[PDB]
Amino acid sequence: NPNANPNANPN
């Protein structure tokens, strides 16, 4: 789940 990463664009 890339939406948990605050330091990258999840697209």
Epitope: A4, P6, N7, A8
Partner: antibody, heavy 121, light 113 residues
Framework: EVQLVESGGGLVQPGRSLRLSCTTS????????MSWFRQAPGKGLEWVGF??????????EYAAFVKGRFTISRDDSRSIAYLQMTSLKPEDTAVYYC????????????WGQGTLVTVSS | DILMTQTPLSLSVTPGQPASISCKSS???????????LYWYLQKPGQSPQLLIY???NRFSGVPERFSGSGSGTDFTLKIRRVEAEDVGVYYC?????????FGQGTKVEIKR
């Protein structure tokens, strides 16, 4: 030194709206994600939401119990982050904390002192 | 949602004796990028939370060396080697690998005199 100050809390009638501010100083505010947490009296820590740097699209993520009702915003020119609450219920009573999310340490690292929100008739 | 189970929920430590707190997650905290998104916080009474350990075993700058963390996958441990009065408060584990970010329920540490 990294400084974060929450404000805007107080007693509010159920159903109404309240906007909290996180006023920051001591760093390039725009470069950092900012996060909100809350702690009901006597209870554990709870994540509310976070908003990414505009360098990564500036979008926000929310916990399930606030989705729809709460929106997190940021004003990079003023170095201020916002939590806009709507449709407030008594179970939203908590100290609300804002925090600077690190880059090496990709979690809430620096925390403010919190602001108490009391939702009651 | 990832459940974070801390044991024990309360600890009474004789001063100078070690403490150990366990945190078990319902899913792996190891990500495909190679990092394990497990963090440990302390909230002293009446204070804002403060970070102790990031990514399982890294001490945050200025945290005393008597704090260490270890573990992998779903089982993690925070160790305080010689507990002092300033270590009293509630300890939380937290994961950031999945949304929502979630915390353990908190482990309360007191001095056993």
């Amino acid at each position: 030194e990294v400084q974060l100050v929450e404000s805007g809390g107080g007693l509010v009638q159920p159903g109404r709206s309240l906007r909290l501010s996180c006023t920051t100083s001591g760093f390039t505010f725009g470069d950092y994600a900012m996060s909100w947490f809350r702690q009901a009296p006597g209870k554990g820590l709870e994540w509310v939401g976070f908003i990414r740097s505009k360098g990564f699209g500036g979008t926000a993520e929310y916990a399930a119990f606030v989705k729809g009702r709460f929106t997190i915003s940021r004003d990079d020119s003023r170095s201020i982050a916002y939590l806009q609450m709507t449709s407030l219920k008594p179970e939203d009573t908590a100290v609300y904390y804002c925090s600077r999310v690190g880059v090496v340490i990709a979690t809430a690292v620096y925390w403010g002192q919190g602001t108490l929100v009391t939702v009651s008739s | 949602d990832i459940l974070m189970t801390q044991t024990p929920l309360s600890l009474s430590v004789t001063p100078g004796q070690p403490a150990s707190i366990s945190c078990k997650s319902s899913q792996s905290l190891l990500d495909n990028d190679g990092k394990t998104y497990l963090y440990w916080y302390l909230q002293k009474p009446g204070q804002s939370p403060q970070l102790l350990i990031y990514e399982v075993s890294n001490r945050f700058s200025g945290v005393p060396e008597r704090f260490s963390g270890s573990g992998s996958g779903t089982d993690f441990t925070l160790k305080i080697r010689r507990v002092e009065a300033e270590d009293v408060g509630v300890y939380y584990c937290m994961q950031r690998i999945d949304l929502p970010w979630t915390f353990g329920q908190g482990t309360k540490v007191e001095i056993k005199r």
